[PDB]
């Protein structure tokens, strides 16, 4: 049970390709819900069990529900993935795939050197040593510290965020009412 992270990486690739090539618009949206589940798997896998259920609650249970709710009672035309339509795209898809992929891998590195910048992204092989220290006396888990720092050090960010939630109330109402 070593290669779990590699498996989630591969399954996420495959799920995005099934997102962007799908018969029916909501077959594509169910593949997105599956990608959210693969994400939450990776987040529990890395050690963040809190966030995975936050993803399942907020992204799956509200955003995907809103999205499916939109696709139901609105009319959306769709062409399917013809080969006549989209292999005119493929040479720039290949060039931009390799370039954007390498370039996203580039900025984790500090060299003057171009491909020493690149292959330090693959210098991964060393197993981190986890030590126990007995300095912490209480059950401050991660949600507790998020609640301490949203509320003391970044209280202003929480209140500007309240203004953003207010805007998310006012705006959709203001569009779709047709006042008398």
């Amino acid at each position: 049970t070593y290669y779990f992270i590699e498996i989630t990486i591969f399954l996420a690739i495959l799920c995005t390709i099934f997102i962007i090539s799908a018969k029916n618009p909501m077959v594509s949206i169910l593949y997105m819900i599956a990608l959210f589940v693969i994400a939450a798997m990776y987040l529990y896998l890395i050690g963040l069990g809190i966030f995975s259920l936050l993803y399942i609650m907020i992204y799956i249970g509200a955003i995907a529900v809103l999205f499916l709710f939109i696709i139901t009672l609105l009319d959306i035309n769709s062409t399917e993935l013809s080969v006549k339509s989209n292999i005119r795209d493929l040479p720039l898809v290949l060039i931009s795939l390799i370039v954007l992929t390498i370039s996203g891998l580039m900025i984790y590195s500090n060299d003057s050197i171009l491909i020493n910048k690149l292959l330090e992204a693959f210098g991964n092989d060393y197993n981190t040593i986890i030590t126990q220290d007995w300095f912490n006396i209480e059950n401050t888990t991660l949600l507790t510290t998020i609640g301490n720092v949203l509320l003391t050090n970044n209280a202003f960010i929480l209140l500007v965020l309240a203004i953003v939630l207010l805007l998310g109330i006012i705006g959709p109402i203001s569009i779709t009412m047709k006042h008398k």
Binding site: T1, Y2, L45, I46, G47, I130, D133, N136
Partner: protein, 171 residues
Amino acid sequence: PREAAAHWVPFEDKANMPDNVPDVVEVGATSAPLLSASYFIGAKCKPYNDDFMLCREESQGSGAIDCLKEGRRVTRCAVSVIEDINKSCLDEFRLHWQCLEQNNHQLSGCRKAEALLNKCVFTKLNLEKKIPGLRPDEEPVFLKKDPWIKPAVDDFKSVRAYAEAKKNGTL
């Protein structure tokens, strides 16, 4: 400080202390005896423990190696407290931490055994259980009569010993 996830595998080390540092014998008490005698370890070994953590504060970052000589003495003084409490109060110390291994190691559920243990240790080992930072006009929690938080089931050996200490006049 962070905990291991995503396929940690445990490993241990076939080695020894170097000759530079002397032998120190270890604490062999587990969590219920350690939690039982925590306040008496803290009552006797307060200046030793505080000199050890003051060492760790004073020479920052060196840490481990420059504070070994007092990490020796905190372990030895706690071992002294634990064998002291064994040879005087073995049966009710055992009564206490055998209560404590049920009830999620909650100190809230073992009041009638800890009254017996505090009385023995205070008259024979002459160490008192105190909670600091508690100003007056505030009652300590393990002294109060009819607390709101009672355990599910009181242990049978400790309520029997508590009643027999009532009728002996021990307590």
